[PDB]
Amino acid sequence: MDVFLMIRRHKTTIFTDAKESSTVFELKRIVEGILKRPPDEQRLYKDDQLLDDGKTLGECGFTSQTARPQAPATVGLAFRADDTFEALCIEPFSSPPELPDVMKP
Template identity: 45%
Template sequence: MQSLPSTSNTYHDCYLQIRRAKQTIFTDVAEATTVYELKQIMGNILRIDPNIIRLSVSGQIFDTDSKQLVEYGITTKEARPQNPFQLEFTLKLDDDSYENIEIVPYTTQTSSSNDES
């Protein structure tokens, strides 16, 4: 009888929420994924060149494509399915600068006119 392949892998998954303006990408990757590999995944999803993507977290720019996510502090402890780790991304402009980071909230706080009687 042939044994079934193991479902556990050496690398645990990090669940990510990657945002730009009104765009949100949810994905899961290994802690050992490099910044460039993540950019390639995003490029495939967005159908753009991964070289124009810049990732950051709270102002910290992921400036070394060869670094693994774990080297930037993204681990399975911080990036869970119930609470994905949030990253921001911007795109390179024609003048080789990058867009300003803009994240549009999912909902806005507005008072409803139905509340008044």
């Protein structure tokens, strides 16, 4: 089916979906249309594992059962600045505050 993703680089997060049967290269083409950087200037990651262009998302471990709309799977993204690819770096979101007393048991 479809997998629901968050493509993340630095302080940028792209929400998109793709078919399990679509390829990493195809996903790079999606990012190209949004961030205006071509596929050979991109590297995609599942955790620390760099994803090969010719593999499908299902073959990389992304499954519709776990990559759902309300809980999308994270794909890491890194850009090639000039000659070299940057190291993969995703900044965490903000930290939720302490639960108030009347919401604690």
